[model samples]
Target: STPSIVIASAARTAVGSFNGAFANTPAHELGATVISAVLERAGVAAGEVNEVILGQVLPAGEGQNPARQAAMKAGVPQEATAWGMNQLAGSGLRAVALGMQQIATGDASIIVAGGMESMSMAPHCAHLRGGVKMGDFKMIDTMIKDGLTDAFYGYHMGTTAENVAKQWQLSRDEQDAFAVASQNKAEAAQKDGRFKDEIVPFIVKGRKGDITVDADEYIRHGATLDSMAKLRPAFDKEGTVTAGNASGLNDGAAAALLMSEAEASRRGIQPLGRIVSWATVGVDPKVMGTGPIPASRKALERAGWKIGDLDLVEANEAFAAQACAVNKDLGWDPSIVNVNGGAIAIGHPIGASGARILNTLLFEMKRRGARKGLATLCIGGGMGVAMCIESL
Candidate 1:
């Protein structure tokens, strides 16, 4: 059998609000910062890294290869090859899984894998068809065009959430309750220093001055069902999906240092967890929210366990209605899923969210001294990704 894939360290920047703290920062810069930090924390030297495979959905101007840019910025040597992947919302964990595959196949030993995104910096694009003056001219916000909108359905992500809510017959009250619960749990986690270990505070150079951004920018501290109920639908006027229930557009980056268990033993690094099994599956784009159900089943089947065997679970809270639906579909206890909050309470940094949630799951699993946990999410285009991990 292939050697076991282990995570030596994981780190992420405090998620920033859209056009907020990280507005001025580039995505590669965020990737480099997290990579540099993760290397140090893992006690793995830059020269020791054999590959740098980062993920991103927005790379229009960041460069030909944002992964190479980040690798060079993090002081990774030319000997270590770098590449980037754009798998929409599933890009982050896809990168991780790719790195694991490389190590598993004996293609490489040490890999730096993760994802990053800067929604604030996603540029606007202008289109000119035939010639400068011969065709129609159209300007578009590339971030929305590429990140939030579902190309297959020609609608925003919120519309997809609305589709799930409609099919599941989810009530606004149910969604509102889930949203409030997410924010409240996040508030409690922050207050008790539960998030202190995984988050890496970074400096932001604002137009006014430089400042330290230490917390998630969008998590409303006083979020309540009443206040959330006061909000209106974000996409369709008559739909159940609301800004209060759906994930916000945010910016952040997260990474994990990975190597085979034998390599970690040689390096004497104590891992927080090991990747037991992972699966990525595609479903109907219209009901993307249900993607996690089949993906989780495949992952669990490969891991030789059932949903009940999990001590904790993290189903990315892309939308409260979707989250509630997934929980109901899987027959999972609300208490075990997202016990300390989720994207609804924190923020969803699109490409980075997959790894961000995995990092969160690892730290929480460590705190509980748990055995197994699953981190899964529904991607924008009917795709689902699940990574099963066990505490070391």
Candidate 2:
């Protein structure tokens, strides 16, 4: 029989807008904050963590083995194994899935798995290594070059979103309405302090003094259809996708502690939820947003569940068009999808978003006494990933 994998605790830093509260903090530092917080919340000793696997999309200048650096800084023993994974936007949840596999296979009893990204710190680079003969060399922004652009088609990630919008026949008004809804929902959640328990307060040293960031920084409180309609197309002039309807480039980190059910029970720890199943599937790069439809279906099938069985779904709002298309394709209840808002309002720190959504979903499920939830996202490189969890 396979060992049951469970998440003992989950926590994340407040998602920061690009170059906002966490601009000066490195990816590993943000990672360490949640790594330590989750273990502390779970009452697990740092030394007991057998492995630390973190996802990072832009590691260009963050030094070697970001996971190891975060673990060491978080007080995990040097003897513990650590590594990083990159599956674009799916990295964080991919790390969680891999950690589940390790626990299921008995390779580790305790693991810290999630994702982190400091997009604000992603550097600009001049590709010419040796020397430039002064011919107006163009500097590339690593945040876009390494994290947001599709490798195969050589276009911005928004272009893929535009493709989905066109294919799904989603109008500009529809996308803007979704974005408005996301902002409104996020504003409501923030006002109600729905995200308080899941957020680990991060302190940033300012020139004046220091400030504690405990809430997401990107949510526009007064966003409306009229406001969103004023923004022009971001990727293509004739396209429906726009900045107001797409997720922001941001910085943040999120992590969860995972252990086998037997081990957790032995330690007298009650887990937040159980990892039932997950799926990752590929699709055409041009219409990558559609990836979640088949991926979610497969995950539900593997867990012997149906769409109706899900009490909540965190279908990442990478773009309003993408979210609208996925919801339509999967036939998910709009009310249950992203009930507490999504990336469009919260910001998308690529590598961290996967685990962020999981944290959000599981916590919301616990709050509402929901039995099942699904967290899913469309990856930048024509792929989608989904994970199903059951509340304990």
Candidate 3:
């Protein structure tokens, strides 16, 4: 049997506002930033990394072989293998898992894995069909084509969340309440510097002088039930989802450095946490929000752990109704879940979120002296992803 997999380091860039500080930054550059930081934190030489896998969506802005591009930019030896993956919203963890599998199978000793996105830089395109007629020419945004629409089902992500609200009987008031809690927790985490280690500063050009963007730019620090309550439904005429209750369009990147436990021990390198198990499941697109219900159950079961035994949970808040429904479905204490806030308050950079939440979970778990934690999210286009983590 192969040795156990361990996460040596985890780090991420400050989440920038949509079309804000990071809009001009290339996606691969964001990937490079995290790769450099994580390797430095783990004390691993770039040449020692045998493989690098990254996840990217909206590639129109990122160019081809984003993983390879980022690996080179981060100074990984040219011989290191690198590739990119696309699993829609689950891409980040999927890439991470690829590295985990490599170490578990004894195929590699150390790997760099993570995800990056710059939706702000997504490009516009027109059909390349031959002999286009007048009025046949229509410019299409690749970001919307891939990021917003479901390939199998042509519904927006918010529309799918709306289905969850309607079927699960989630009330608008409950959604707003959940959103309020997310904001409050995020604000608390920021005030206490809980995110300091996980976030790296990004220097951006300003109108006057260069400015450093060091924290999540989308969090509504003063958000409350009253403020969210006043916002009108955004997706549908009578839908429960609103801008205040849904995740923000964002740009960011996150990464983790990993090696087998035996390898880490042999090298005298300390690990932050161990990834015990992971699971990915598919559900109906209409009720995609319920994905965490099944995904988390399978991951916990495979890891031989109970939900009650998990000291922390990071369930991405794609929409407040979906997040609230997950809490009810899992029968979890609201206090133990997303203790540091979620996408609603911190912003969701799709591919980056899967790894981001896991990093956040391990950081918070360490802070609280906790033993075990869970990171899970509802993916767009009828899917979910979950990973089980144990703090060292």
Candidate 4:
């Protein structure tokens, strides 16, 4: 309905996975890096940002408040306002929504919003916090403090993906096709320097030394139908979802500086594009990744655009199954879905994913000589988030 400038959008260090950069990294720093990137990208001095909104489902350590900690780490002014990590399970989507709400409400301008997570450091099982076993009475805070849990759903995300596959009747062949498509598409995009257009390289001081960052640390070119089919199912022996077709556990962060049309013009900053519309929808948590079903419909309805109107679609390939299912439900042709591959070939860093999805969408849209695009994800805990954008 209205036009605006997306002042800046940037992502942080590549997500760390098994034995990756985030092995011992903190959650706050992951998100903090993206805020720093945003400020740098938006041409705003760190001191100019007035507020921060961050989202994270897993805190790396006790008393880990991702937003407040990220604000301090990102060098947000001491007087800047902050919110903690208890924001939303939908990850960065919640952070972006809150930032947009603030902008729309005139509560603040130039707010830093995104999410971070370090599943690498979070305990896999619920920790024993108090002396009591089952019926032990303890405050929620005390349990967390006592190491009651770093974070676990009593089942891993892979297990949930497997369950969703069973319910959706996703087969091994279907998943294999999906996985191959991810690697194939992403490889093309990478070769064409699509990721290079927006991938923020990092200077990591490793055992070797500081080095110039380039392409993704996890993308593999050897992915093929034959290779993917030869892999073992991740969660279940007979399950269809495999490591080849599933989202990699990664460490990374992303950010976008949203601004009103009048404000952007007044400030004279160029936008990548305006967020024409966005929406979130609820779904059965058991099939949490199917969230895009209702979410895409809502966003399209609000924008008055049909599925065909979108020139490109960036559906988070959380799993090959859900990615294909949701897109099919939305009527997106496979050829147009994740035209440059998706999370299966790359990876997903829980809270950090939404912004990453948008970043890829914007870059791909421009590359294809298209003007409009959509980014969608099936979030954990059964939810979906979508945003429509036009290249500016």
Total residue pair clashes for candidate 2: 0
**Descending-lDDT candidate ranking:** 2, 1, 3, 4
lDDT of 1 at 76: 95
Off by over 4 Å in 1: 134-136, 206-209
Task: Compose the digit string of candidate 2's lDDT tens values, residues 1-392.
Answer: 86789999999999999888898899998999999999999999998999999999888887888889999999999999999999999999999999999988868889999999999999898878778867888799988898988999999999999899988899999999999999999999999999999999998867899899999999999887998999999999988998899999899999999998888888888888999999999999888888888899999999999999999999999999989999998897899999999999999999999999999998899899999999999998899999999987
By TM-score, the better pick of 1 and 4 is: 1
103-181: candidate 3 lDDT, tens digit per residue: 8776898999988888898889976867565565768887778887777778688999998999889999999999998
Cα RMSD for candidates in order: 1.4, 1.0, 1.4, 4.2
Best candidate according to lDDT: 2
Which pairs of residues have clashing backbones in candidate 3? none
Give residue 377's lDDT in candidate 3 (0 to 100).
90
Q: Which one wins on TM-score?
A: 2
Give TM per candidate: 0.97, 0.98, 0.97, 0.87
Model 4, stretches more than 4 Å misplaced?
A: 1-7, 62-64, 85-89, 124-154, 206-208
Deviation (Å) of 37 in candidate 4:
1.7
